[PDB]
Design a binder for this molecule. Structure first.
Ligand SMILES: [Mg+2]
Ligand SMILES: [Zn+2]
Ligand SMILES: [Zn+2]
Ligand SMILES: [Zn+2]
Lengths: 99, 123, 570, 95, 578, 145, 199, 83
RNA sequence: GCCACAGAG
DNA sequence: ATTTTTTTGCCTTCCGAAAATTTTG
DNA sequence: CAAAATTTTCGGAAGGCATGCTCTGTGGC
């Protein structure tokens, strides 16, 4: 929340974000802007690229392609808002390790 | 309030539901019973589809274990299939870049399926 | 379903997922997947979706298929005439072959049993079982193989008399236009052919001409037009039958020519059948028989269903459109084989037909009674026939096909949305632009019935609202709404609707066969056939009966749609 | 570097940058998102702003390389074990 | 036995594929259809009514209810979508200009694209080059649209095509209307369409002459129903030239016209808690959703019972305006609605501005483990140190994982507890999911049973790495990383040599203190943003952390030419600096 | 998890038994090892065995299945008594006959002593082999190398 | 009966396991993942035999455990078609007989379509009777050493159901599934059946 | 196949500041998860200082995989890199 | 909760 | 149903109107 | 040669954005 009357947190705005970028600190940026603020474990379907729940994809009606990831909750809220605006931000996933 | 005024024809108890059906209710008159001529026409469709499906030009969808037994001997081979390159192609009807997947100078046989006047469809 | 239906049930028992597909792509992909394999279906679908594509583009646009598989399925599609091609060289010198999709092969696959039945009926071989079976099997082989040579077909037949009868039947098919010679014309596109001819005859004109640019364009396009007509009319000249008397003085088609099915002649026959069905509802039954005989006599030399020059993009000039209309009106009349008299029809009437007492003058195949039938055909409200001179008649196709389209469309509306919808549509079409009050005055039924019926008609593009704004901002309350009927929009929408219905029916049939594949594979065996009641369980027998009945109903409904869909192809 | 003088503005960034999330987070979010939806463009997540929005490691700074732990397994430690049955079996006597 | 091998692979996001949901995609992701204007039913103590805009199947807005779809509370529910079928199609305000452009490029009679085959093939070849970026793609698309505009008659038919545009270009209902002037380029003569038009108007003016003054402004309107029906038979081969990829089922023009409205989950449009009334205020999206339901129900009832066409068109325009306000509130004037003022918070208003999702919650956001305090000088600290109040240090914690090298230290910190500053506030066990507050337990059994994988949130101690920030962040030196020291005087303290990168003076400045919560972030902060490693500004390479005022003066007075010290004063000065 | 090839090689029951006995000796899972250290005396060394319960259970079940006698007759399986050179010489005796790889594998796995069981393992036994060769192979198998 | 499968996998070695030998840690992780579990469309895995290739340990940003791509050969229990094997009868039902190979795999079922002709089941004593001859007093007694022939192997999918369906199913359960791997035994030739009968 | 051999390495042999920071963070995260250390720690408890001590005399078991923009990578041992 | 001004650097 | 404004600058896209140029008769 | 179609140029209006970055309070609906 905002303000010390609500025990709120201090805003790390765009300028401070960009100052952290200028140092090249990728992990510090990830920790400040995802881990300590709005981290959220979510289930994404690998086929249709949409976003599921409880290890289940409500579009494909199957649990075969569900992948658990961690995203900021603001990203999830933005994706649902865009889906409500008839915009489909289908995520595409790739393996982290080249194999 | 945006939810008060109504048109003259409508009433207050008729609005507010919005149940639009997903299933249609206006059928075409083609849904009558089948006749003899239509049944012969339909079995002609079925026979033609069966002929094309088993023909040389199908290009299908995109337990043969490695162990060898004595029962593998005295076992019939399934069916010697006629391939894509076993047809007498007229080479003037095709582009030059498709020649290498055909049979330019290999064995050619023309598979002919005989029409069956009897109705293969069981009732 | 009075209770609430979850979106699960909506998605799984209804056709909502199939309503988002383009009807042309859906129908073509379903037909190719039903007849050929899934790889050919993928290639045809990508060709429809992306337009023309090279082999490299087809490889890089379809996942999981390499160059060899693409080339193999392209060969398979090309043999069945489902893919057109054009080989063009760029300025840099590289040569690329671009493959199209052509509706000719897909319509051949769609009309196949109808084509076979038409061939069986149109040469009066129904009385003779041997000739009928031979004709059916040769037509089925021609359609299934796309194009075949007579020598290769006869190489599988050992009886000399059987070979002679097969050759005679092939000659009979060739002379009446149903089998033609396949060539690179049937694989080259019409638009590309006309573009090539126009460019050649434009570059043929030398420089520094005194005539202007428009005159140069007109001369080049006239020369290209006559060259295009001469090229298109080539397979109809019977050049492949001219080999006469190799031995014992009989006419046989050449053993080195590739014969194929002629779709245009079949569509001419379908047009004749549609006109006969239309005439059956206006002028009698004996008069309908006379009209049937007259149309079947002048069926082979009737004008084509669609003039290919109209598909060259040349209709962007109004002068070209009216020139096409004038040329069609002239060729429907002054063709030597189209005009006919009563004496000509007297030689082809069946023995059962009498004509004797069918006419009452006041309140043996005689020529006067035939002339009376042709007169009442020509004097009817619908222009079934027109008289160039007293006693001679011809079929005015260019003035009869719009009437047939209008009647079929109006009766489809009457059968689906009710007769009041037909009355409203005809009232709006009679006087072109009308208000609600004028509709209520001219068409005597209740105003709320008018409003509900036209609201129902709006959803299918039958009635278009013309808004007349009476304020600076076009508010709906202050404006006044008139109604007009647009023919082209309604015909296009109904054609697309029937196409989607055909595609949905084929998809349902394919899904049913896929889900009963095990029983269908067990039943479709040589030993099991003819012994179904013994080697199968009663439950399996009942399931097989139900599946076969459903498939028969599907194909019959598809035929009935085809009788209703080709009218908008005209 | 794009052949013309673009300028540091929303119209300059609309031509310089082909990404969607970077342009949406800067200025005129609705128009950019709806244009991306209509034209069906694919946004590769390589930019820093996209990695920040989606919560993953940015590709510059400490993310411009990958840390790998060198395993100490030699090749001699990975020789195949004794497969005795498939090695002693021969079918010279059928055939 | 019977278990199946399961394999999980770590996956990252490779890209996004923006598109628009079709009807099948909207219904497929839906859980219940919104088919009631009533949010609550009055007979069940104001419960969320089934098949309403606040149906439980979309989620919960309160912490006391259950989702009845995934059966979870407000904390563990991701929210689920509903769908809402419209009685008549309406134009999407977001895709409205795209609808104008795609109507300008097709024939208004047969839905064919207004291009010759040569131009079509050349443009398709241009669009398919390997090095095509967004700018070149939009340039080619604009060229295609211009060439389509210059076409006077179609190629597949002889129909006349004029100019397609907005009706009035304002802010009311008329701003969401499409008009096609067929006879704008009619010229002088030879137009059969003009003859048909004048025949129609001669026929209709025979009964109502009063419309004669309005014939000039009468042009071919394109209502969303006719526009959708015209889009439906657009050939897929022409969709690439309009900018739409037709290789996917959802890549069609008719997708960009509102037929099914996806009702958002209630977890993103929650009901606000009460302030002074027993009732709870609803979000603007829910109210607009109920209004859309009511208007669509009215339109359906009018179509099924035969209301006047003027009323049907008025309610169609009202539905279109309501959906437009639901998507973008400032696109149309609220005064045009019959009910209507503060403009509602639409979906576009939630995304734009400094308080939107992108700039207020995605690019920058509020963080945990941060403190803000007035700053005061302290020269006795080293330049790489900041003094934190012990009151602040007892709140800002660092989660230290118990290892074999720090077990006794964390045992002692757990024993000390939350009140003594060298202590800890929370303990999280290896096998548990919820951390236990350390002010309620035994604090001696927990210390003795400290396993070698626990996470104990110890107080911020001396030597901890912290981020120290001043909010006008002009350059990267405005945020640095300091080693923490613990002091009792309730203010952040930094050496005055370090206030120059911050541009800070001790006249009331307040600064921020972040505590990185992971080892990687801590090491990156202390090795890339340390004061020792950032003595030089990157703008020019000159030192930025150096002697400030009152340190230059004293050094000058020491190094003055007439400064002479005996051994006692020399030694005292040397001890004074070390 | 990708299966490069479903069947890379064929394992005789002797190879599996030998490998799993070596595994149990390495991980101190044998009955002697668990009875000596973990039972009847205190664990002053605290040399705990391998913790993995699922692998221990499956290897105990397999070693018990392969350790009890093969049911050629109604108390040892014989494969628990064989060695490498005995396996080699017995198998090279088995290649001399007209047997296939699967038939030889089944012969090595089960060690038939019953006449009808040897009938059951190999197909077309009467047609392919006369009584003399069947008697010789039965004597060779029943002799246990 | 036992074969070797070559499988490529990605194993995560936690940093607290760095003190062990790398081969031991990789084998331990693979044993955790694979031992006594059904490899789909392959069979039941017992123990990893050996490792053929190991790649370099790659590290994910945000975690210290090393991820290694490893190719390994594992011993999998997959009786090929036509192989005979000896089991112990566990339970006999109306549809057939259930036999287990002494704890390793308890999912072997022999139906009536491929047992001895004319056999019948008596619910009074829970046994099947084979009328071979006048001395027909032979019983498929439980806990007895039967010998059978594998005739078919069946794999099913482990596809879970909808979360609402799963929730209501467990709610009803609070108020049997097809195994992923199964084999079909038979008795169609002399030499099958009990061990003592053909003594 | 994308690995550049050790002889044909072209990237600078000096360890950049970002490589130092990432190496220290990774080693501290490993030590905080109870990994063994290869230094004689003199009562130090914080993993970061142990990681600094490990880097001080080059007793750290990691290598750096530098990606060139084309796709080929380049493996440098941390003890090989000059700091 | 939304607005509204008031201040701090 | 009379009737104020309450920062200042910059930028692109649209859209008739008029001008410029080519193209038909 | 000048009437008619096509294309380009040129305006004024219509949209949009900016009008710092953080932080602390109150008062009224
Ligand atoms: Mg100050
Ligand atoms: Zn999915
Ligand atoms: Zn939920
Ligand atoms: Zn057109």
């Amino acid at each position: 929340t905002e303000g010390r009357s609500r025990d709120g947190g201090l805003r790390l705005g765009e300028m401070e974000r960009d100052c952290v970028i200028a140092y090249g600190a990728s992990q510090l940026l990830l920790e400040r802007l995802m881990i300590s603020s709005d981290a959220f474990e979510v289930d994404v379907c690998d086929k249709c690229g949409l976003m599921g729940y409880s290890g289940w994809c409500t579009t494909c009606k199957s649990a075969e392609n569900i992948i658990k990831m961690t995203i900021p909750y603001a990203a999830k809220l933005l994706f649902q808002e865009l889906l409500s605006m008839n915009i489909a931000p289908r995520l595409r996933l790739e393996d982290i390790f080249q194999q | 309030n945006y939810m008060s005024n109504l048109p003259f024809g409508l009433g207050y108890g008729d609005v507010g539901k919005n149940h639009i059906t997903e299933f249609p209710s206006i059928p075409l008159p083609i849904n009558g019973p089948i006749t003899n001529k239509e049944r012969s026409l339909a079995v002609k469709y079925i026979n033609f589809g069966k002929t094309v499906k088993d023909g040389p030009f199908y290009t299908g969808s995109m337990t043969n274990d490695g162990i060898e037994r004595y029962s593998d001997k005295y076992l019939k081979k399934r069916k010697i299939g006629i391939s894509i390159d076993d047809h007498p192609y007229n080479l003037n009807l095709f582009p030059n870049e498709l020649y290498n997947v055909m049979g330019i100078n290999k064995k050619k046989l023309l598979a002919i399926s005989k029409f069956n006047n009897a109705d293969d469809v069981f009732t | 379903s009075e209770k609430l239906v979850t979106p699960e049930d909506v998605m799984t028992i209804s056709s909502l997922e199939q309503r988002t597909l383009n009807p042309d792509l859906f129908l073509y992909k379903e037909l190719v997947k039903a007849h050929l394999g899934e790889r050919a279906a993928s290639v045809i679908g990508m060709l429809v979706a992306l337009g023309r594509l090279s082999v490299r583009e087809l490889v890089e646009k379809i996942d999981g298929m390499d160059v060899d598989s693409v080339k193999t399925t392209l060969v398979s599609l090309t043999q069945l005439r489902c893919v057109k091609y054009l080989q063009e060289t760029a300025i840099s010198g590289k040569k690329t072959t671009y493959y199209y999709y052509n509706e000719e092969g897909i319509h051949i696959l769609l009309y196949s049993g109808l084509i076979i039945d038409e061939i069986i009926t149109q040469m009066r071989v129904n009385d003779e079982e041997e000739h009928k079976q031979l004709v059916a099997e040769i037509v089925q082989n021609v359609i299934s193989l796309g194009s075949l040579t007579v020598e290769d077909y006869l190489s599988s037949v050992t009886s000399d008399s059987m070979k002679y009868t097969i050759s005679s039947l092939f000659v009979q098919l060739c002379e009446m236009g149903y089998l033609i010679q396949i060539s690179k014309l049937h694989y080259t596109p019409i638009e590309d052919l006309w573009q090539f001819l126009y460019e050649k005859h434009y570059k043929n004109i030398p420089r520094n001409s005194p005539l202007s640019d428009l005159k140069k364009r007109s001369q080049a396009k006239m020369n290209a037009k006559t060259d295009f007509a001469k090229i298109i009319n080539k397979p109809n000249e019977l050049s492949q039958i001219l080999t006469v008397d190799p031995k014992t003085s009989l006419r046989i088609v050449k053993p080195t020519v590739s014969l194929t099915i002629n779709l245009d002649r079949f569509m001419k026959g379908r047009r004749s059948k549609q006109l006969i069905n239309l005439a059956k509802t206006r002028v009698g039954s004996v008069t309908a028989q006379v009209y049937k005989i007259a149309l079947r006599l002048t069926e082979q030399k009737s004008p084509k269903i669609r003039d290919p020059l109209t598909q060259t993009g040349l209709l962007q000039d109004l002068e070209e459109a009216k020139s096409f209309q004038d040329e069609a009106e002239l060729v429907e009349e002054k063709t030597p084989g189209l005009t006919f008299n009563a004496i000509d029809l007297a030689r082809h009437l069946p023995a059962e037909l009498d004509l004797r007492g069918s006419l009452l003058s006041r309140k043996p195949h005689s020529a006067s009674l035939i002339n009376s039938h042709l007169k009442i055909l020509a004097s009817s409200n619908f222009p079934f026939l027109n008289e160039t001179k007293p006693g001679v008649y011809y079929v005015p196709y260019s003035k009869l096909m719009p009437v047939l389209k209008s009647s079929v469309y109006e009766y489809v509306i009457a059968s689906t949305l009710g007769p009041s919808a037909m009355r409203l549509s005809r009232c709006i079409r009679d006087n072109k632009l009308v208000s609600e009050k004028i509709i209520n005055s001219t068409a005597l039924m209740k105003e709320k019935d008018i409003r509900s019926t036209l609201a129902s008609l709006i959803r299918y593009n039958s009635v278009e609202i013309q808004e007349v704004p009476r304020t600076a901002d076009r508010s709906a309350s202050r404006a006044v709404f008139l109604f007009r009927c647009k023919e082209t929009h309604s015909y296009n929408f109904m054609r697309q609707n029937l196409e989607w219905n055909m595609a949905n029916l084929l998809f349902k049939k394919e899904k049913l066969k896929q889900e009963n594949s095990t029983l269908l594979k067990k039943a479709n065996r040589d030993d099991v056939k003819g012994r179904e009641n013994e080697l199968l369980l009663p439950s399996e027998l009942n399931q097989l009966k139900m599946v076969n009945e459903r498939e028969l109903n599907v194909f019959a409904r598809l035929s009935r749609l085809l009788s209703l869909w080709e009218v908008f192809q005209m | 570097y794009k052949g013309e003088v673009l300028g540091i503005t929303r119209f300059g960034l609309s031509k310089m940058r082909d990404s969607v999330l970077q342009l949406a987070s800067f200025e005129k979010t609705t128009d950019h998102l709806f244009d991306a939806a209509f034209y069906m463009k694919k946004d590769a997540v390589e930019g820093v702003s996209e990695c920040i929005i989606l919560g993953q490691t940015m590709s510059i700074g400490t993310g411009s390389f990958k840390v790998v732990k060198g395993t100490n397994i030699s090749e001699k430690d990975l020789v195949p074990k004794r497969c005795l049955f498939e090695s002693l079996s021969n079918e010279a006597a059928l055939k | 036995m019977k278990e199946v091998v399961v394999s999980e692979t770590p996956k990252r996001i490779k890209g996004l594929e923006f598109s628009a949901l079709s009807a099948a995609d909207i219904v497929a992701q839906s859980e219940v259809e919104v088919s009631t204007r009533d949010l609550f039913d009055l007979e069940k103590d104001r419960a969320p009514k089934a098949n309403g805009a606040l149906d439980p199947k979309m989620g919960v807005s309160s912490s006391s209810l259950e989702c009845a779809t995934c059966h979870g509370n407000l904390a563990s529910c991701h929210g689920h979508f509903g769908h809402l079928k419209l009685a008549l199609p309406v134009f999407h305000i977001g895709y409205f200009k795209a609808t104008i452009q795609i109507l300008q490029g097709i024939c208004k009679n047969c839905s064919a694209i207004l291009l010759s085959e040569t131009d079509k093939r050349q443009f398709l070849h241009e669009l398919r080059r390997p090095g095509v970026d967004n700018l070149r793609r939009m340039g080619i698309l604009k060229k295609i649209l211009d060439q389509c505009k210059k076409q006077r008659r179609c190629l597949h038919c002889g129909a006349l095509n004029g100019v397609v545009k907005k009706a009035a270009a304002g802010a009311g209902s008329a701003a969401l209307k499409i008009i096609h002037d067929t006879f704008r380029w009619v010229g002088k003569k030879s137009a059969p369409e003009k003859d048909i038009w004048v025949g129609e108007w001669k026929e209709v003016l025979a009964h109502n002459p009063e419309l004669e003054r309005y014939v000039k402004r009468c042009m071919d309107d394109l209502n969303p129903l006719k526009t959708l029906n015209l889009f439906k038979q657009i050939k897929s081969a022409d969709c690439e030239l309009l900018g739409i990829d037709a290789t996917v089922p959802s890549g069609r023009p008719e997708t960009y016209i509102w037929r099914y409205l996806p009702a958002p989950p209630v977890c993103i449009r929650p009901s606000v808690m009460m302030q002074d009334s027993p009732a709870s205020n609803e979000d603007d999206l829910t109210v607009k959703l109920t209004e859309i339901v009511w208007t669509s129900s009215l339109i359906k009832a009018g179509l099924d019972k035969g209301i006047s066409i003027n009323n049907m068109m008025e309610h169609w325009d009202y539905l279109q305006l309501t959906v437009a306000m639901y998507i973008n509130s400032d696109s149309v004037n609220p005064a045009m609605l019959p009910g209507s003022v503060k403009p509602i918070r639409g979906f576009c208003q939630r995304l734009k501005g400094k308080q939107g999702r992108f700039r207020g919650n995605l690019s920058g956001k509020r963080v945990d483990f941060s403190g803000r305090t007035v700053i005061s000088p302290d020269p006795n600290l080293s330049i790489d140190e900041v003094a934190v109040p012990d009151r602040v240090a007892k709140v800002l914690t660092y989660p230290e994982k118990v290892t074999r090298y720090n077990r006794h230290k964390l045992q002692e910190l757990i024993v000390n507890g939350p009140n003594v500053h060298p202590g800890a506030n929370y303990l999280l066990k290896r096998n548990e999911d919820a951390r236990r507050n350390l002010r309620y337990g035994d604090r001696m059994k927990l210390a003795k049973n400290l396993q070698i994988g626990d996470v104990v949130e110890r107080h911020l101690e001396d030597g901890d790495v912290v981020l120290f920030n001043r909010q006008p962040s002009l350059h990267r030196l405005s945020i640095l990383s300091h080693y923490a020291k613990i002091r009792p005087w309730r203010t952040f303290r930094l050496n005055e040599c370090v206030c120059t990168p911050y541009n800070a003076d001790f006249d009331g400045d307040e600064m921020n203190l972040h505590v990185p919560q992971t080892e990687e972030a801590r090491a990156e902060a202390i090795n890339l943003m340390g004061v020792k490693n950032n003595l030089l500004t990157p703008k020019s390479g000159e030192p930025i952390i150096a002697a400030t005022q009152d340190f230059i003066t004293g050094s000058y007075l020491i190094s003055h030419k007439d400064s002479f010290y005996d051994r006692a004063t020399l030694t005292q000065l040397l001890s004074m600096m070390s | 998890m990708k299966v490069l090839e479903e069947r890379n090689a064929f394992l005789s029951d002797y190879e599996v038994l030998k490998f799993l006995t070596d595994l149990e000796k390495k991980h101190l899972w044998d009955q002697k090892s668990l009875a000596a250290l973990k039972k009847s005396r205190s664990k002053g060394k605290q040399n705990r065995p391998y913790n993995h319960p699922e692998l221990q259970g499956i290897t105990r079940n397999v070693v018990n299945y392969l350790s009890i006698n093969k049911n050629f007759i109604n108390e040892k399986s014989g494969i628990s008594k064989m060695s490498d050179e005995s396996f080699a010489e017995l198998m090279t005796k088995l290649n001399s006959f007209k047997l296939f790889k699967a038939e030889k594998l089944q012969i090595v796995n089960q060690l038939p002593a019953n006449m009808v069981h040897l009938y059951s393992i190999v197909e077309e036994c009467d047609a392919r082999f006369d009584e003399k060769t069947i008697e010789e192979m039965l004597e060779i198998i029943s002799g246990y190398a | 009966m036992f074969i070797l499968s070559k499988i490529a996998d990605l194993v995560r070695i936690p940093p607290d396991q760095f003190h062990r030998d790398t081969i031991s840690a990789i084998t331990h992780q693979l044993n955790n993942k694979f031992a006594n579990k059904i490899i789909p469309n392959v069979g039941l895995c017992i123990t990893i035999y050996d490792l053929l290739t190991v790649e370099e340990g790659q590290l994910k940003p945000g975690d210290g455990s090393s991820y290694i791509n490893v190719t390994f050969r594992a011993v999998v229990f997959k009786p090929f078609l036509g192989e005979i094997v000896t089991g112990w009868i566990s339970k006999c039902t109306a549809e057939g007989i259930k036999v287990s190979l002494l704890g390793i795999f308890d999912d072997i079922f022999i139906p009536q379509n491929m047992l001895f002709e004319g056999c019948y089941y008596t619910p009074e004593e829970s046994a099947w009777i084979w009328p071979m001859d006048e001395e027909t007093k032979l019983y498929f007694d439980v806990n007895e050493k039967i010998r059978f022939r594998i005739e078919r192997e069946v794999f099913v999918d482990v596809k879970p159901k909808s979360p609402k369906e799963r929730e209501l199913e467990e709610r009803a359960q609070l108020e049997e599934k097809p195994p992923a791997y199964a084999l079909l035994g038979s008795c169609q030739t002399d030499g099958m059946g009990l061990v003592s009968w053909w003594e | 196949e994308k690995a550049i051999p050790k002889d044909q390495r072209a990237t600078t042999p000096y360890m950049t500041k970002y490589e130092r920071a990432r190496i220290l963070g990774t080693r501290a995260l490993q030590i905080s998860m109870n990994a063994p250390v290869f230094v004689d720690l003199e009562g130090e408890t914080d993993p970061l200082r142990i990681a600094m001590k490990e880097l001080a005399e080059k007793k750290i078991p990691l290598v750096i995989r530098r990606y060139l923009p084309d796709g080929s990578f380049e493996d440098w041992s941390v003890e090989e890199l000059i700091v």
